Design an enzyme around this catalytic site. Sequence first.
Site, PDB file in Angstrom:
ATOM      1  N   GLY A 210       0.831  -1.173   0.000  1.00 42.99           N
ATOM      2  CA  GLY A 210       0.000   0.000   0.000  1.00 42.99           C
ATOM      3  C   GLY A 210       0.882   1.244   0.000  1.00 42.99           C
TER       4      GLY A 210
ATOM      5  N   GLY B 269       2.838   4.221   1.022  1.00 42.94           N
ATOM      6  CA  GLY B 269       4.003   4.091   1.880  1.00 42.94           C
ATOM      7  C   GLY B 269       4.443   2.628   1.990  1.00 42.94           C
TER       8      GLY B 269
ATOM      9  N   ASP C  66       8.635   0.294  -4.098  1.00 39.26           N
ATOM     10  CA  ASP C  66       8.623   1.594  -3.443  1.00 39.26           C
ATOM     11  C   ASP C  66       9.978   2.293  -3.578  1.00 39.26           C
ATOM     12  OD1 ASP C  66       5.971   1.158  -2.835  1.00 39.26           O
ATOM     13  OD2 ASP C  66       5.968   1.048  -0.809  1.00 39.26           O
TER      14      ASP C  66
ATOM     15  N   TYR D  69      10.636   3.507  -7.264  1.00 36.26           N
ATOM     16  CA  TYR D  69       9.958   4.764  -7.561  1.00 36.26           C
ATOM     17  C   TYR D  69      10.686   5.947  -6.918  1.00 36.26           C
ATOM     18  CZ  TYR D  69       5.636   3.275  -9.790  1.00 36.26           C
ATOM     19  OH  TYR D  69       4.640   2.784 -10.585  1.00 36.26           O
TER      20      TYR D  69
ATOM     21  N   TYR E  16       4.352   5.251 -20.230  1.00 39.67           N
ATOM     22  CA  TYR E  16       5.532   4.675 -20.858  1.00 39.67           C
ATOM     23  C   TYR E  16       5.111   3.683 -21.943  1.00 39.67           C
ATOM     24  CZ  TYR E  16       4.499   1.327 -17.053  1.00 39.67           C
ATOM     25  OH  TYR E  16       3.854   0.472 -16.196  1.00 39.67           O
TER      26      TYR E  16
HETATM   27 CA   LIG Z   1       4.245   0.957  -0.729  1.00 37.85          CA
END
Ligand SMILES: [Ca+2]
Lengths: 119, 119, 119
Positions: B29, B31, B48, B51, B67
């Site tokens: 999820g 965070g 995470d 990114y 993309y």
């Molecule tokens: Ca996450």
Amino acid sequence: NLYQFKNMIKCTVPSRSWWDFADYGCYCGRGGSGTPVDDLDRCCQVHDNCYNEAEKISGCWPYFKTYSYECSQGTLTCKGDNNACAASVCDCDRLAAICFAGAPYNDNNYNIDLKARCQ
Amino acid sequence: NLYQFKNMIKCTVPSRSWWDFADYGCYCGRGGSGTPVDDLDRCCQVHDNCYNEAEKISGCWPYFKTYSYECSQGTLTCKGDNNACAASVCDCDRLAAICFAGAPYNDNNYNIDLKARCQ
Amino acid sequence: NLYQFKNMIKCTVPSRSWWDFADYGCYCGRGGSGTPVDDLDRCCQVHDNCYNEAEKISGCWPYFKTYSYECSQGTLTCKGDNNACAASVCDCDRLAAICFAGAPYNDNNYNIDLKARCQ
Ligand SMILES: [Ca+2]
Ligand SMILES: [Ca+2]
Ligand SMILES: [Ca+2]
């Protein structure tokens, strides 16, 4: 797109805020599962479904697709200049916003524990 | 962009739905914190951080960047026509979708109550 | 747009992550209802309000609108090249980011049970 959908709900149910619908029942909100808890939630189930079909048009991304529509006195219509993606997404949104105006809003069904009510 | 990532996961894990992954473990999820509860959640921790790395290039906005990629028979490829940000965000997603198909889904780790397990 | 709001918070409160604010109190997440739990939550409530005003410009979509701003060692400015929508969304963002830097962060107010304390 998301803001346009929030605006259609303003056209049809001016008294309620977007956030009253965003976390309602088992389907109005991210995903959905179980049996719709009432008629409003049933509107949301039909809309999650409709987005699913719309997404089979290649490159059709419902929350990001901008379409053309008009609100006139609580009435909603999707314009002719829409391409196929935009026309399906717009239709999904106006049928949900019309549906929401006719369902009773039950406050006991807002922000329910999904783990206990939506198997 | 978000929808392309959803479709990459449809390419490798046709059997599960995006929502199965969206609230899984401590990282999948919004965070992430603590120790990945398993190998799927660890795929998310890696996603995470990829990114975070992608966001270093000016104006690279991973959830919004369209993309170019190809899904052929469960295989994903980021094709070469798309710019530095696009290339990078594509690769982040590709690697995460591959990873999700390799790891087992622990149904008892879907929407854990984070204060208790992600410290 | 939302990544630019994320970067404004990084200009003003470089020591915290975006996710510390994303789920705080009654207002900092999706929606908001109730009494702000403290001064940081009040920053968020004013920001949710500010976005509702900005959305009165036709086609002005706060999370999606890209604007022009400068971060100069903890101070923020919205630049003059912005059109009315961009200038309004930038100002909302700017004032929330400055507000966050002057509020104490309460770890017990992160990710609270909205049901018990926000309605
Ligand atoms: Ca996450
Ligand atoms: Ca739903
Ligand atoms: Ca809020």
